Amino acid sequence: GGSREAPIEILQRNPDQPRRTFREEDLEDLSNSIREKGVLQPILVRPSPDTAGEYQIVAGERRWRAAQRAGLKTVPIMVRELDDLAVLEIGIIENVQRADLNVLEEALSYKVLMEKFERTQENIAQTIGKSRSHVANTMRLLALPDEVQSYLVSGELTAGHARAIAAAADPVALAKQIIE
Amino acid sequence: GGSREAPIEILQRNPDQPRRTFREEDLEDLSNSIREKGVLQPILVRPSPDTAGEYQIVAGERRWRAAQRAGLKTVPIMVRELDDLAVLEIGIIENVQRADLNVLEEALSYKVLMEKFERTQENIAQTIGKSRSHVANTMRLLALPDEVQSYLVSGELTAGHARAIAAAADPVALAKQIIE
Ligand SMILES: Nc1ccn([C@@H]2O[C@H](COP(=O)(O)OP(=O)(O)OP(=O)(O)O)[C@@H](O)[C@H]2O)c(=O)n1
Ligand SMILES: Nc1ccn([C@@H]2O[C@H](COP(=O)(O)OP(=O)(O)OP(=O)(O)O)[C@@H](O)[C@H]2O)c(=O)n1
Ligand SMILES: [Mg+2]
Ligand SMILES: [Mg+2]
């Protein structure tokens, strides 16, 4: 059994899904991102244990909720027979076994969009489903010295602190201030 | 066009993929995780622009490399016609449009594996493809006071710092020390 488009309305959440909390800010970004390029990773479901002809989401609740807000009529699914232990395992694995992109690898990606493909920071924001603010701030990090970038490449400079350092009117000045 | 199993050997990487660096530590965890439950999210590819009957990975290089080390003969793929702008966009989106699990939501998930399903910390480690160390340290956080957990629930307490705080013989003592 491969992956198929299926009517969004015949899908339901597992209450015992490892993820409890869902921030509006993030869900808005995903629904925006889905409105543009659609649902890119198919949603993992098992046949519903409670209701007939329904599917219980094993992995991809945010995708389902985002696609709902985005007003998509169908979603891509993969149906696999799974017991309650399998689902909890998979639920953890999909979210735990994945490496985040370095904020500089992200910034460089935006540079290439601008230079090689002549995309404005607005064009980028609209396509990737993030704010013009986030894009601008992310790219400003490319200005910083090689040494401070090496701190972000290494992780020494906190990834959270990076977005803050970027927002500053005098961003490079906050490099030495990071020590204290 | 859905998703199909395809021989791992007819897949190649895009050199211009947003992600440049690949840490051995993480790739080992993924290959372990894949050795157990296989490749859970199908790998997004376009028909190779250079070589005939080959596919260029748009999203899922780590999965491909992990599955390779894991000695998988086939991998699940989805083939879509995509130009160089599409691929760079999608490459960014799949990695940028996704929310990480709270370290406490992770710990609780492991608790339920132990209590509801009678899994040892070794059983968990083997199935999720992480270290017994990582599992033990992650669960120890559930012991900590509601106040310091609120710091991790909020994010104030660095998620990386959490596993370290947990390992400490006197973990709660690091709460006031989080001033610096
Ligand atoms: N047994 C597993 C473990 C993990 N994953 C998935 O593999 C992906 C790993 O994400 P990432 O670190 O970004 O690597 P890839 O997407 O494989 O590669 P890249 O982003 O570099 O293209 C995640 O979707 C995760 O759910 C999976 O399909 N099967
Ligand atoms: N246009 C987009 C944007 C993002 N994604 C994918 O949506 C997932 C978001 O991951 P996460 O934040 O964990 O949410 P879900 O996996 O959807 O939900 P859950 O983990 O709660 O099951 C990622 O694999 C990302 O590649 C996608 O398919 N299409
Ligand atoms: Mg997920
Ligand atoms: Mg990825």
Residue numbers in the entry:
A (entry chain B), B (entry chain A): 42 to 221
Original authors' sentences:
In most bacterial species, faithful chromosome segregation is mediated by the tripartite ParA-ParB-parS system. ParB, a CTPase and DNA-binding protein, nucleates on parS before spreading to adjacent non-specific DNA to form a higher-order nucleoprotein complex. The ParB-DNA nucleoprotein complex stimulates the ATPase activity of ParA, driving the movement of the parS locus (and subsequently, the whole chromosome) to the opposite pole of the cell. ParB spreads by sliding along the DNA, in a manner that depends on the binding of a co-factor, cytidine triphosphate (CTP).
Next, to gain insight into the spreading state of ParB, we solved a 2.7 Å resolution structure of C. crescentus ParB∆CTD in complex with CTPɣS. Hence, we modeled CTP, instead of CTPɣS, into the electron density. The asymmetric unit contains two copies of ParB∆CTD, each with a CTPɣS molecule and a coordinated Mg2+ ion bound at the NTD. In contrast to the open conformation of the ParB∆CTD-parS structure, nucleotide-bound NTDs from opposite subunits self-dimerize (with an interface area of 2111 Å2, as determined by PISA; Krissinel, 2015), thus adopting a closed conformation. Each CTPɣS molecule is sandwiched between helices α1, α2, α3 from one subunit and helix α3′ from the opposite subunit. Ten amino acids form hydrogen-bonding contacts with three phosphate groups of CTPɣS, either directly or via the coordinated Mg2+ ion. Four amino acids at helix α1 and the α1–β2 intervening loop provide hydrogen-bonding interactions to the cytosine ring, hence are termed the C-motif (C for cytosine motif). The C-motif forms a snug fit to the pyrimidine moiety, thus is incompatible with larger purine moieties such as those from ATP or GTP. However, in the spreading state, as represented by the ParB∆CTD-CTPɣS structure, α3 swings outwards by 101o to pack itself with α4′ from the opposing subunit. By overlaying the CTPɣS-bound structure onto the parS DNA complex, it is clear that the DBDs in the spreading state clash severely with DNA, hence are no longer compatible with parS DNA binding.
